[PDB]
Amino acid sequence: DIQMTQIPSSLSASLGDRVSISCRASQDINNFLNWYQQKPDGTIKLLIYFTSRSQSGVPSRFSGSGSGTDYSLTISNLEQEDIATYFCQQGNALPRTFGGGTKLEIKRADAAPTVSIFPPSSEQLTSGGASVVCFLNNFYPKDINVKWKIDGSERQNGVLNSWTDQDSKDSTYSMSSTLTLTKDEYERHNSYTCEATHKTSTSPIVKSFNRNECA
Amino acid sequence: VQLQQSGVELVRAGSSVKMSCKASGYTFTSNGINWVKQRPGQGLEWIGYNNPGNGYITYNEKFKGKTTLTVDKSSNTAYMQLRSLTSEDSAVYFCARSEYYGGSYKFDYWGQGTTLTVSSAGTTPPSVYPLAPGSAAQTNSMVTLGCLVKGYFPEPVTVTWNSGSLSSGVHTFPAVLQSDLYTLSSSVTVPSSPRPSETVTCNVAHPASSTKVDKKIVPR
């Protein structure tokens, strides 16, 4: 197959920036290269075809170029609606192959997460289950490390993490981490700690609660 | 031009599905139809092609055998049949139209895609649990409340706070698959002025099971 590699797998840029995305083929593709845009909602449209022909209805800030095995897609001035995943595809031979895709995000100033932790609700405890939830909200960059500790020992088992897409208005990310135990194991320990490590600080952010602290 | 998709999506391992892609807005026999697979793990995969005009079909050797492409010219519908379904077949499948441009083709119009979920799970309504700030004074000025929606199937659930009147400060996280069941959560940050002098309730709806649950967040 002709292997297609997109150089920057993910890219950060500020609105107004000139963005350029690379696509390399394993062998000369004779300019038969098309570009697709996948919006965060999963839908896809053709952007550019035959290396540099613009498809009807697409913004004039998108242009493409290249030859042989090297092609690029350039956004002249990044707009918010351009936040998406872009894919090159070769139409020189079968099977048709696509590049791995390049996802864009808006670059902004760093922002430390607002962390909050929540003890299992009593409704859940009645069912014999126990989930401790920790929200880490509105931070930038996306890279964050969360570790759970129970009486000084660390997490690992029973953790479910989930991230939101970059917020369209303030460009930050949010994350939620949940530690689930049985009611039996929960009631045999005192403290539960959610510990986050982010670029914004040399020392982790720690939020804890003690089971007995019934205020 | 428009490619409207859909076929069975919630299936069990070992079965087969026949998905459809109905074209409109142009002369169906004039353009070939391609099928593409996209697993949650980012990437796109070309499955095969079918030209309803000349009846030419071609497959990607990978899918050749597990896949059967057919077309019904009378109704302008393209079909793809997957068989011997496994967990690695769970993906979104798109159909796209080919258009000749001097030398090669461009996939110019795409269908919205059909999500194929292979699972053993049965329709199950969620357990909604109110999350009130714990133990010591959790937060100053603003207060963060949450709602844990655990163990439901299938997707999706819709979460709203105060029947939607509370839209600012809310974060609803993408559902995560735990043991073949989904779990998700949502948080809301209100000034210490509102709760608990003012009522905060999380409302979750699960269409698949016709379930609706209202959970008021009250002080621990």
Together in a domain, A2 and A27: yes
Together in a domain, A94 and A115: no
The DSSP letter of residue A164 is P
Closest CA to A15 of A73, A61, A53, A56: A61
In a domain, A101, yes or no: yes
CA distance A138 to B169: 10
Instruction: Pinpoint the alpha helices (H) of B52-143.
Output: none
Total CB pairs under 8 A between chain A and B: 142
Together in a domain, A14 and A69: yes
Q: Do B101 and A100 touch (CB under 8 A)?
A: no
Structural contact between residues B92 and B38, judged by C-beta atoms closer than 8 angstroms:
yes
CA distance A79 to A81: 6
Instruction: Give the closest of A31, A101, A162 to B42, CB-based.
Output: A101
Q: Which of A107, A132, A152 is the last residue of a domain?
A: A107
Structural element, H or E, at residue A124: helix A122-126
Best mutation site among A23, A89, A118 for testing chain B: the one with the most B CBs within 10 Å? A118
Structural element, H or E, at residue B36: strand B33-38
Alpha-carbon gap: A117 to the closest alpha carbon of chain B (Å): 7
In a domain, A26, yes or no: yes
Instruction: Give the closest of A137, A214, A215 to B187, CB-based.
Output: A137
CA distance A173 to B167: 17
Cis peptide before A204 (omega within 30 of 0): no
> Domain limits at A146?
108-210
Q: Which domains, from first to last, does chain B contain?
A: 1-120 (2.60.40.10), 121-220 (2.60.40.10)
Together in a domain, A102 and A4: yes
Q: CA dihedral defined by A119, A122, A124, A129, rounded to 10 degrees?
A: 70
Alpha-carbon gap: B33 to the closest alpha carbon of chain A (Å): 13
Together in a domain, A11 and A62: yes
Together in a domain, A100 and A157: no
Together in a domain, A140 and A152: yes
Together in a domain, A130 and A60: no
- This structure's resolution (Å) is 1.9
CA distance A118 to A80: 34
A167 Cβ partners below 8 Å, 6+ apart? A138, A173, A174
Structural contact between residues B182 and B188, judged by C-beta atoms closer than 8 angstroms:
no
Helix, strand or coil, per DSSP, at residue B17 = strand
Together in a domain, A79 and A147: no
In a domain, A60, yes or no: yes
Q: In what order do the strands lie in the sheet with A19-25?
A: A4-6, A19-25, A70-75, A62-67
Q: Which of A107, A125, A151 is the last residue of a domain?
A: A107
Chain A residues closer than 8 Å to B130 by CB: 121, 123
Q: What are phi and psi of B86, to 5 degrees?
A: -135, 175
Question: What's the distance, CA B101 to chain centroid?
Answer: 33
In a domain, A137, yes or no: yes
Q: Do B133 and A116 touch (CB under 8 A)?
A: yes
Q: What are phi and psi of A125, to 5 degrees?
A: -60, -30
The DSSP letter of residue B164 is G
Q: Do A131 and B150 touch (CB under 8 A)?
A: yes
Q: Do B101 and A49 touch (CB under 8 A)?
A: yes
Q: Do A210 and B135 touch (CB under 8 A)?
A: yes
Alpha-carbon gap: A188 to the closest alpha carbon of chain B (Å): 17
- What the block records as the tokens of B220 is 């621990």
Structural contact between residues B22 and B3, judged by C-beta atoms closer than 8 angstroms:
yes
Q: For position A101, which CATH number holds?
A: 2.60.40.10
Number of H helices, E strands in chain A: 2, 19
Chain A residues closer than 8 Å to B45 by CB: 98
In a domain, A80, yes or no: yes
Best mutation site among B45, B69, B106 for testing chain A: the one with the most A CBs within 10 Å? B106
In a domain, A215, yes or no: no
Together in a domain, A145 and A199: yes
Together in a domain, A65 and A159: no
Chain B residues closer than 8 Å to A31 by CB: 103
Q: Residue A208's CB: how many other CB atoms inside 10 A? A: 17
Cis peptide before B156 (omega within 30 of 0): yes
Q: Which of A63, A82, A107 is the last residue of a domain?
A: A107
CB contact, 8 Å: B108 with chain A?
yes
Q: Do B46 and A97 touch (CB under 8 A)?
A: yes
For chain B positions 158-197, those within 8 Å of chain A (CB to CB) are: 171-176, 178, 183-185, 187, 189
Q: How many domains does chain A have?
A: 2
In a domain, A192, yes or no: yes
Nearest chain B residue to A120 by CA distance is: B131
Cα–Cα–Cα angle for A42, A44, A48, nearest 5°?
150
Together in a domain, A44 and A100: yes
Structural contact between residues B105 and B31, judged by C-beta atoms closer than 8 angstroms:
no
- What the block records as the tokens of B163 is 């029947």
Q: What are phi and psi of B88, to 5 degrees?
A: -80, 0
Q: Exposure of A159 by Cβ count < 10 A (0-12 exposed, 13-18 middle, 19+ buried)?
A: middle
